Structures are given as C-alpha cells and as structure tokens.
Coordinates of C-alpha atoms and ligand atoms in Angstrom, one line a residue:
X1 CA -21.3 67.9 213.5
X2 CA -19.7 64.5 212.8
X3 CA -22.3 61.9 212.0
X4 CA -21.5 57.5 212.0
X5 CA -22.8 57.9 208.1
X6 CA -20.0 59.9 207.7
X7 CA -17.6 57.2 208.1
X8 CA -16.7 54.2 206.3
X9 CA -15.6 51.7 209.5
X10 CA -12.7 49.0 208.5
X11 CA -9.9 46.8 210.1
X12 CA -10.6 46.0 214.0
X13 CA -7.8 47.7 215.8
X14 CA -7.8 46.7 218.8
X15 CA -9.8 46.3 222.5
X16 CA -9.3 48.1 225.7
X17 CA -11.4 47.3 229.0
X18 CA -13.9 50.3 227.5
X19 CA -12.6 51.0 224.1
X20 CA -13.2 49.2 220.6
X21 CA -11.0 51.0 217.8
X22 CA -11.8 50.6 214.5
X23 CA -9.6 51.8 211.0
X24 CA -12.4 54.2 209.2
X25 CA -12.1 56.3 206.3
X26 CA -14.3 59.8 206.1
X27 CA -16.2 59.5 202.8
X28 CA -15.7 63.3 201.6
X29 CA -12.2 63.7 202.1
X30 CA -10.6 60.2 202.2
X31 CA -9.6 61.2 205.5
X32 CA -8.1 57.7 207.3
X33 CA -8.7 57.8 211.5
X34 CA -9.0 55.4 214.3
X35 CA -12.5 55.7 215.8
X36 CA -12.8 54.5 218.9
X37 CA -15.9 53.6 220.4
X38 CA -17.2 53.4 223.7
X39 CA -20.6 51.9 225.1
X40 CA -22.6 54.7 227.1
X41 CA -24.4 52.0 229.3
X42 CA -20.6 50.5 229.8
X43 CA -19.2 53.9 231.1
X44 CA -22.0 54.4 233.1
X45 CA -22.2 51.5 234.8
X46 CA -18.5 51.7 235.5
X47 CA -18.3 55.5 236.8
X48 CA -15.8 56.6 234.0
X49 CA -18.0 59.6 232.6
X50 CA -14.9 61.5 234.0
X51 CA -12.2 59.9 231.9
X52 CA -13.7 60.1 229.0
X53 CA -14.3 64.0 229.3
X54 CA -10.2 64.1 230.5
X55 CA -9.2 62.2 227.5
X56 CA -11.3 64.4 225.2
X57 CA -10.0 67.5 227.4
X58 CA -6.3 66.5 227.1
X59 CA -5.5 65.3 223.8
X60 CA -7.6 67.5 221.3
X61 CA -6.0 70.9 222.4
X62 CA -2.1 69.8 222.3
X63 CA 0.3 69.3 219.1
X64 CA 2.8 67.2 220.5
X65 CA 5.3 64.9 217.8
X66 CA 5.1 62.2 220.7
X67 CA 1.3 62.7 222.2
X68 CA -1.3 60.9 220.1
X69 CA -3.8 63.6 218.5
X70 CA -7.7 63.0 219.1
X71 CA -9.6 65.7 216.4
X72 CA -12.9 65.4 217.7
X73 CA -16.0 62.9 218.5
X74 CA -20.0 62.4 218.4
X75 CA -22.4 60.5 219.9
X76 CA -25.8 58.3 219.1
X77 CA -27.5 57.0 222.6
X78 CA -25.9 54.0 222.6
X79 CA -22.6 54.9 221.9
X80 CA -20.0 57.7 222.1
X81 CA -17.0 57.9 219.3
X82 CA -13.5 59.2 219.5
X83 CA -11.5 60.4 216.3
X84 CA -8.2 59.9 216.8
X85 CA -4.9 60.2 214.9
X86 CA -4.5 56.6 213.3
X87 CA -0.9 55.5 214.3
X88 CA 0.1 52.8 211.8
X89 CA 2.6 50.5 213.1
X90 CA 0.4 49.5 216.1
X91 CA 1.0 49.4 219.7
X92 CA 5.0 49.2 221.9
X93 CA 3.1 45.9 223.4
X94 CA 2.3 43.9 219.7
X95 CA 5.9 44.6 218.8
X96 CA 7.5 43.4 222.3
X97 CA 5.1 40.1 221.7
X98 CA 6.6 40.3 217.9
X99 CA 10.7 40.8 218.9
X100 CA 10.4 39.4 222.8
X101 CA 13.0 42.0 223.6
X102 CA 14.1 45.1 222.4
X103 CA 18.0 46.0 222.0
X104 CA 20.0 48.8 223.9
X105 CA 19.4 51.3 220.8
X106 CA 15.5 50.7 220.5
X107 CA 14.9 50.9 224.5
X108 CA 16.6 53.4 225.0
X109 CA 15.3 56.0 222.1
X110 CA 12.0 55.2 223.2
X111 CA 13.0 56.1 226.8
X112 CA 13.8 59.1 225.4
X113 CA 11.0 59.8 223.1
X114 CA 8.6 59.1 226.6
X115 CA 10.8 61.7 229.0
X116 CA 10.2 64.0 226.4
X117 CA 6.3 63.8 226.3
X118 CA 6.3 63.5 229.8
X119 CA 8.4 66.2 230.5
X120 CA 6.1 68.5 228.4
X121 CA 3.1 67.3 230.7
X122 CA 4.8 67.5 234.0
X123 CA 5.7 71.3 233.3
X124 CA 1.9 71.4 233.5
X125 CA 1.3 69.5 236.6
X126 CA -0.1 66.6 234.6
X127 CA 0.4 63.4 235.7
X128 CA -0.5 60.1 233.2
X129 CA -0.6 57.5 235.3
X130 CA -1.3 54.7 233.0
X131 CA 1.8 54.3 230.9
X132 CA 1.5 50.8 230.3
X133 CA 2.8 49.2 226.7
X134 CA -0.5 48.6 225.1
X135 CA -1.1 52.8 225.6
X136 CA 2.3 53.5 223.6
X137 CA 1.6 53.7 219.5
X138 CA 3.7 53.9 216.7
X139 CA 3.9 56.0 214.1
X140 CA 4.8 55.9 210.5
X141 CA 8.0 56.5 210.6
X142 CA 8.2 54.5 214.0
X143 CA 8.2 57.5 216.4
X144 CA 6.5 56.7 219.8
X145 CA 3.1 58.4 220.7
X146 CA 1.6 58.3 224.1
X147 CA -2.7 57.8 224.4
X148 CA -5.5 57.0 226.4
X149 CA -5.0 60.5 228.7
X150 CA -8.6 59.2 230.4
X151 CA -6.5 58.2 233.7
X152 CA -4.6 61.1 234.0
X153 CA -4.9 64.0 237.0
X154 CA -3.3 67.3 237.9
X155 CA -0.8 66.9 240.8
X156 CA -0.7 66.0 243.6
X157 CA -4.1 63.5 243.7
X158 CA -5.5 61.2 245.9
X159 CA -7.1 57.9 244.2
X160 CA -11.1 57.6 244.0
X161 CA -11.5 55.1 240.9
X162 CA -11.1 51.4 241.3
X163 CA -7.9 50.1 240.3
X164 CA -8.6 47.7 236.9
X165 CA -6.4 45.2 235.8
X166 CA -2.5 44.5 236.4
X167 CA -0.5 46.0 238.9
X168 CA 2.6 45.9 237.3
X169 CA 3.2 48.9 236.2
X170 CA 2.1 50.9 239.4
X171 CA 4.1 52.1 242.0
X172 CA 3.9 51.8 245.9
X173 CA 2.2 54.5 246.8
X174 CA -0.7 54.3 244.2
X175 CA -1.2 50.3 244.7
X176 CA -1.5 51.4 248.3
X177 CA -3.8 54.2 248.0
X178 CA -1.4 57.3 249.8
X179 CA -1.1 60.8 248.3
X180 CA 1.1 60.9 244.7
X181 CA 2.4 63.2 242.2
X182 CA 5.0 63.4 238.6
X183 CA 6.8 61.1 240.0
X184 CA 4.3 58.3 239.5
X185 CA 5.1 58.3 235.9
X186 CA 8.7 58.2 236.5
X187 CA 8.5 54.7 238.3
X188 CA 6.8 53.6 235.4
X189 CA 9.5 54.4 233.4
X190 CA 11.7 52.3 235.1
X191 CA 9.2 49.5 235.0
X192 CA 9.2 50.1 230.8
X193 CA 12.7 50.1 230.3
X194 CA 13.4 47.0 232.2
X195 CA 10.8 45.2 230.5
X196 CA 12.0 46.3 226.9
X197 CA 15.4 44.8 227.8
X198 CA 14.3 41.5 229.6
X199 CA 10.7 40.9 227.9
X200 CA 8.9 40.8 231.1
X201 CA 8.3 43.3 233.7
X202 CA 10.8 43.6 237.0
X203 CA 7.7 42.5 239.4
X204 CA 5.6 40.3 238.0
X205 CA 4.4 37.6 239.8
X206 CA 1.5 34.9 239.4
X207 CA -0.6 35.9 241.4
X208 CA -2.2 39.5 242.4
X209 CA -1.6 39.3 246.2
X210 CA 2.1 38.0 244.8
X211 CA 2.5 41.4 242.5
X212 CA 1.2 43.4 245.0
X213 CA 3.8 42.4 247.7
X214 CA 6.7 42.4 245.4
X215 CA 6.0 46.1 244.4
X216 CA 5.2 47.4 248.0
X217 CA 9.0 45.7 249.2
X218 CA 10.0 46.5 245.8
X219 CA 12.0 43.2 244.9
X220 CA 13.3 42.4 241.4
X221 CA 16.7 41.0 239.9
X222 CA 18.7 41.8 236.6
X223 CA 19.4 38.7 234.5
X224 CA 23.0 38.3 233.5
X225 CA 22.6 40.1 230.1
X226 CA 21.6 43.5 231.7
X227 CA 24.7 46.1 231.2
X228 CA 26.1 48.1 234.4
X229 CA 24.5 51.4 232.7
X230 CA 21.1 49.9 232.2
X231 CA 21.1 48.9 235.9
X232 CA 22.0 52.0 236.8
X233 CA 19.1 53.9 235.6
X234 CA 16.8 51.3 236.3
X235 CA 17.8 51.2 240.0
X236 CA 17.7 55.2 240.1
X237 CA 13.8 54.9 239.2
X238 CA 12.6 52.1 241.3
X239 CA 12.9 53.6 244.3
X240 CA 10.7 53.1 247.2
X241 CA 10.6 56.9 248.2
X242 CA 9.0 59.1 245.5
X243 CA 11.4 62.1 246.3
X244 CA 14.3 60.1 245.7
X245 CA 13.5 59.7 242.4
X246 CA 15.4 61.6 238.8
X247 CA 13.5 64.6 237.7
X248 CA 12.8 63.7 233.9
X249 CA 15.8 66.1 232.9
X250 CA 18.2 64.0 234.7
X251 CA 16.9 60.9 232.8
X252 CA 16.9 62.4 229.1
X253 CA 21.3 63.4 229.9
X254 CA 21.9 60.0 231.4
X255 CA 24.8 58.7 230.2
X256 CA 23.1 55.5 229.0
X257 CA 20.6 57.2 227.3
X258 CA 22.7 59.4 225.5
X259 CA 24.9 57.0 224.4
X260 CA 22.5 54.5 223.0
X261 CA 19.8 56.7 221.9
X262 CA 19.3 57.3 218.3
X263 CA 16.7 60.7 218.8
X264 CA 17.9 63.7 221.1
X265 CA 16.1 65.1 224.0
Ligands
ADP1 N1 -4.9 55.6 217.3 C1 -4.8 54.3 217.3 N2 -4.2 53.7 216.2 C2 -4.1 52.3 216.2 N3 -4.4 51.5 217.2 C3 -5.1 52.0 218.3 C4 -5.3 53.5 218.4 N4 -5.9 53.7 219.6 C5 -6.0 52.5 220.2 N5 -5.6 51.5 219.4 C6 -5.6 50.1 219.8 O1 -6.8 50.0 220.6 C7 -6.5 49.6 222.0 C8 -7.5 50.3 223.0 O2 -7.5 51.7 222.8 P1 -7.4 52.6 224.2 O3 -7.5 54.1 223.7 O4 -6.2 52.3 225.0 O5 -8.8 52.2 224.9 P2 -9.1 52.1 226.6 O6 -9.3 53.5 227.1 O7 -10.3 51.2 226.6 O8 -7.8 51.3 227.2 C9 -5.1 50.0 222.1 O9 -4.5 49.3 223.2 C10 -4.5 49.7 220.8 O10 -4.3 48.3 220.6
A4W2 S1 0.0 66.6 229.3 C1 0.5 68.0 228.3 C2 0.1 69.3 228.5 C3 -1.4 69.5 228.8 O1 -2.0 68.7 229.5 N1 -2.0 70.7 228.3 C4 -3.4 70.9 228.6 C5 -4.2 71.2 227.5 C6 -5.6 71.4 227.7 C7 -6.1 71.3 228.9 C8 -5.3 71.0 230.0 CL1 -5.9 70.9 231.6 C9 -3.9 70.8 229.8 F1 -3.2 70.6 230.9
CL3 CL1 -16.6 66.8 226.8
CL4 CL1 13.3 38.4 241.4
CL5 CL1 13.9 54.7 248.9
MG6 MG1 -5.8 51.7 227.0
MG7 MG1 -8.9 54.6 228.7

C-alpha cells in the first residue's frame, strides 16, 4: 500500500549496525513517523531475513504504553522500510552521554517502567535479548519504550546468529553459547541499573577477550556512592546461575524500587 513518494523524509535519527531512521512526515495526513530503513543486499548478506520478519511480527500486533509501536512497512528492491512510532526525546543512551549518570528517582522509575514491559512479554514466553541503552526511547512525556524486537525468541532457545558488537550487556550463558530462557533479560536488567547509577557498565573491560572473562567469573565492584539498597538489587540479578535469579514480580515490589520510583508497577 505504502509507497517512498508518500513520505516527506527529514532529520537523520540515528544508525544501528542494519538500520538508518529517518524523521518523515506522510504528505496526506501530516502524519510524523520514524522510518527506518534497511538495505536488502545488507540483510542478506548478513542472514538477518529472520529478524526483520520478528520485529515486524512482534511490534505491529501489541499496544503496549512502554513497547514502541511499528504501524506498518514497504519495500522497493533495494530497500525495505519500517514505520514506526516516532519517540521524541531520543534514545536512554544519548541522555546517559547528556547527564553521565542518572539519580536514584530516574534509575529506578525506568527499572520499573522496563519490568513492566518485560513482564508483559515473559507471560508470553518471549524473551528480548537485546536490551541494551541505545534500544530504550523516550517518549513525549519521557516515558520509556522498548524497540528493535528483531533479536528476540520464544523460550527456551539455543543461539544460531553471530553475536555483533559488545558483550556487555550479555549474560554467561548466552556469551558462552548454552541453553537460555526469561531470565536472560533479567541479567540485563541488573547490567542497566548499575550503569544508570555509575555511568558505565559493571563489566566493561578494554578488551573483548577482557569483557568476556569478567562476565563468565562475573567480577564487578560498587563505587563508594552506590546505596546498600541499590547493591542489593543489583547483586540479586547478577548472578551466575540463571535459576537463582528474581522473577520480574519480585523486582517491580523491591523495596528500593518502590521507594524511589516515581511510576507504579
Ligand atoms: N522510533 C524512533 N524514534 C527516534 N529514534 C529512533 C527510533 N527508532 C530508532 N531510532 C534511532 O535509530 C537507532 C537504530 O534503530 P534500531 O531500530 O535499533 O536499528 P538496528 O535494528 O539496526 O539496531 C536507534 O538506536 C535510535 O538512535
Ligand atoms: S513481547 C509481548 C507480547 C507478544 O510478543 N505478543 C505477541 C504478538 C504477536 C505475535 C507474537 Cl508471537 C507474540 F508473542
Ligand atoms: Cl513479514
Ligand atoms: Cl572491578
Ligand atoms: Cl550463582
Ligand atoms: Mg538497535
Ligand atoms: Mg535490530
């Protein structure tokens, strides 16, 4: 239906390993999107036909307040385009750059705006996988929205697609290629909300074989700064064992969380 004369393209967004988002206005209605737009020889080339159809799958049938909408797409032989819900005060990761680290309020409403989007999937079987900060949008009232659905799976799941960039926000048993399942995501949770309070994340390292061993002994430190509750929750996610880990319920009543949280669960 949708056609690229349709659109009037605008502001460059922003750049993912496959994705190049535009600002665009539809011409009939006024209608302002994100289009995002991917190069077929690119996906091809890569193997990623898959998470591209997920994405699509995923995020065009739910109505979630923190779960970024995608209302449709096209394509032209070159190229495929995503419409997507513009979200207009940018990505978690530009504003971290902006603030270098978030207070106890911020971090921990997000937290909780995250367990509830999550907790929504899980009861599903979903699994995200790639809840990293430059995947976490803002809308207009500053309200956090999860995207890019492409690396997500039904559990449990093995691992067939090459790993990409950082490991830092992966846990053990992904980076080592075993058997996983929900409680992936909550590891990266714990990886988030120590790096909204600190500015960096708990195992980053120089180097890749560096990361890599740091996450499989799983070895990080608080700085002085970090309150008794914070560490608490924290050191309840970053466990080595999967099992041992919170179920996303026991997160969103925390007593940390509901103390410094300014949204409920
Ligand atoms: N709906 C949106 N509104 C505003 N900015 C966006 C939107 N979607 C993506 N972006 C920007 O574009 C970048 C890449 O988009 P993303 O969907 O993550 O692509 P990829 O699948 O290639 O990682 C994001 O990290 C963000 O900076
Ligand atoms: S992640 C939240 C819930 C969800 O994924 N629902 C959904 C919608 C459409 C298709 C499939 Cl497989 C789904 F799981
Ligand atoms: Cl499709
Ligand atoms: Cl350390
Ligand atoms: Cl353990
Ligand atoms: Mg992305
Ligand atoms: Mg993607």
């Amino acid at each position: 239906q949708w056609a690229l004369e349709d659109f009037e393209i605008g502001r460059p967004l922003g750049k993912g390993k496959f994705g190049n988002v535009y600002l665009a206005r539809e011409k009939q209605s006024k209608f302002i999107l994100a289009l995002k737009v991917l190069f077929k020889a690119q996906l091809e080339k890569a193997g990623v036909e898959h998470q591209l159809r997920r994405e699509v799958e995923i995020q065009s049938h739910l109505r979630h307040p923190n779960i970024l909408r995608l209302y449709g797409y096209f394509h032209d032989a070159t190229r495929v385009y995503l419409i997507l819900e513009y979200a207009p005060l940018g990505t978690v990761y530009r504003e971290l750059q902006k603030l270098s680290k978030f207070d106890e309020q911020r971090t921990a409403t997000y937290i909780t705006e995250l367990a509830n989007a999550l907790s929504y999937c899980h009861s599903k079987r979903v699994i995200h996988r790639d809840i990293k900060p430059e995947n976490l949008l803002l809308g207009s009232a500053g309200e956090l929205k999860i995207a890019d659905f492409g690396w997500s799976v039904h559990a449990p799941s093995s691992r067939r697609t090459t790993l990409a960039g950082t490991l830092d926000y992966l846990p053990p048993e992904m980076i080592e290629g075993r058997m996983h399942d929900e409680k992936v995501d909550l590891w990266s949770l714990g990886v988030l909300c120590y790096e909204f309070l600190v500015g960096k994340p708990p195992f980053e390292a120089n180097t890749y074989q560096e990361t890599y061993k740091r996450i499989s002994r799983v070895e990080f430190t608080f700085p002085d700064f970090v309150t008794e509750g914070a560490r608490d929750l924290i050191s309840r996610l970053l466990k080595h064992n999967p099992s041992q880990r919170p179920m996303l319920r026991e997160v969103l009543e925390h007593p940390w969380i509901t103390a410094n949280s300014s949204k409920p669960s």
